[PDB]
């Protein structure tokens, strides 16, 4: 049995109607769960035999469906139904569909940060790039040095979406040495995002 | 109501074995099977078997059979899973769960809290916390942004707070990138008006449990 979840990803706005789809390959049954999952916890049961509601589960939660195909509806999206949503069958799950808040655009609010004197000191150089409070998630970030394209000496990482005020923020960290970080002058971080008419460029002078 | 309560995060090195238990309490422990699914760190779920604590007969998935060993203890209502021959790829969230009815058994109306367990060749180390201080360059309007630079742990997780905890608003901690290293390295930052920067002190408070690493920072201009 594969049960193929669809769409991967759903960004709809609160008080609206979602519904996800769940598709089960080799499935004569009515059998079939659905779960909530919220960063940093445990899943949370919504829905079994298809349609009943899990303990603790409100009623704009719905599912419907049987033998291959299946449907979970959020009849008005509160703020709190915003998560990462599995079905199964059997021992089988599928691979997730992230439903996440649509609000309106928001620029990022960016900021950068030389390396501090005491890391420094030990001989290491990383470079910090802030992009604070943003949406949509999609956002594009390029280090470059004396305005050459660096690639392979950064890493990053994004925030869940906010609870309150549903953004995004992204910290992008370029590593050097000491000795390399020396040779150069001019550190800059560009970004795109679509709140941005053309791509904003933060930068220092060692 | 009932409760599974699972054993604590463990570290391990591939070819070690791991084992970890659930508790449970609030309803007839041989009653119910239970399952163990677990969760890879950015992924999905993925069950592993179910054992029955009646009989101690098992049922494991196809992909672990002769890796994976459950059993059970009555007497304290504890269900064990041990699994061997670790590898980095077995990196996750373990969970105990139970199903909510009998006759199909699937519907996980209970889970554990889950037991991180991290596989690596690593070693426990500290982080470095190395400031990241407000400057023009962090500043838009009259508010600027600071932060911390936790670098170079093992294992997750680190805990970090500003001023004690006294501080919350403004504040994005952000998910641990695992280096090339083997060591993990994550930032905390916060936003706070420009103006106070001169008065208010700003301290990261950095705690790593598994090295008993406490560290504090103070973030200046």
């Known amino acids: 049995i594969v049960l193929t979840q669809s769409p991967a990803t759903l960004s709809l706005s609160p008080g609206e109607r979602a519904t996800l789809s769940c598709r089960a390959s080799?499935?004569?049954?009515?059998?079939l769960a659905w779960y909530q999952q919220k960063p940093g916890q445990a899943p949370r049961l919504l829905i079994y035999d298809a349609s009943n509601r899990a303990t603790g589960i409100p009623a704009r939660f719905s599912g419907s469906g049987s033998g291959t195909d299946f449907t979970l509806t959020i009849s008005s999206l509160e703020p709190e139904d915003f998560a990462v949503y599995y079905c199964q069958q059997y021992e089988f799950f599928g691979q997730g569909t992230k439903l996440e808040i649509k609000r309106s655009t928001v620029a990022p609010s960016v900021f950068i940060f030389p390396p501090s004197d005491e890391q420094l000191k030990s001989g290491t150089a990383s470079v910090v790039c802030l992009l604070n409070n943003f949406y949509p998630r999609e956002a594009k970030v390029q280090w470059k040095v004396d305005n050459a394209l660096q690639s392979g000496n950064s890493q990053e990482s994004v925030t869940e979406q906010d609870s309150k005020d549903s953004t995004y923020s992204l910290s992008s960290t370029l590593t050097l040495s000491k000795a390399d970080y020396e040779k150069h002058k001019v550190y800059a971080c560009e970004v795109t995002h679509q709140g941005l008419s053309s791509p904003v460029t933060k930068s220092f002078n060692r | 109501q009932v409760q599974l309560v699972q054993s604590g995060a463990e570290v391990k090195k591939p070819g070690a074995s791991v084992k970890v238990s659930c508790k449970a309490s609030?309803?007839?422990?041989?009653?119910?099977?239970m399952h163990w699914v677990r969760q890879a760190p950015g992924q999905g779920l993925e069950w592993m078997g179910w054992?029955?604590?009646?009989?101690?007969?098992?049922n494991y998935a196809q992909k672990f059979q002769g890796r994976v060993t459950m059993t059970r203890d009555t007497s304290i209502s504890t269900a064990y899973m041990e699994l061997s021959r670790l590898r980095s790829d077995d990196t996750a969230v373990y969970y105990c769960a139970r199903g909510k009815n009998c006759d199909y058994n699937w519907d996980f109306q209970h889970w554990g809290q889950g037991t991180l367990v991290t596989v690596s060749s690593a070693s426990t180390k500290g982080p470095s916390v190395f400031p990241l201080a407000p400057s023009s360059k962090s500043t838009s309007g009259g508010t600027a942004a600071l932060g911390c630079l936790v670098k170079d742990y093992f294992p997750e997780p680190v805990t970090v707070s500003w001023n004690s905890g006294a501080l919350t608003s403004g504040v994005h901690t952000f998910p641990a990138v695992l280096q090339s290293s083997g060591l993990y390295s994550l930032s905390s930052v916060v936003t706070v008006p420009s103006s106070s920067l001169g008065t208010q002190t700003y301290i990261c408070n950095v705690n790593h449990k598994p090295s008993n690493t406490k560290v504090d920072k103070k973030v200046e201009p």
């Open positions: 054992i029955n604590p009646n009989s101690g007969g098992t």
């Open positions: 609030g309803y007839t422990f041989t009653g119910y099977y």
């Open positions: 080799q499935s004569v049954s009515s059998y």
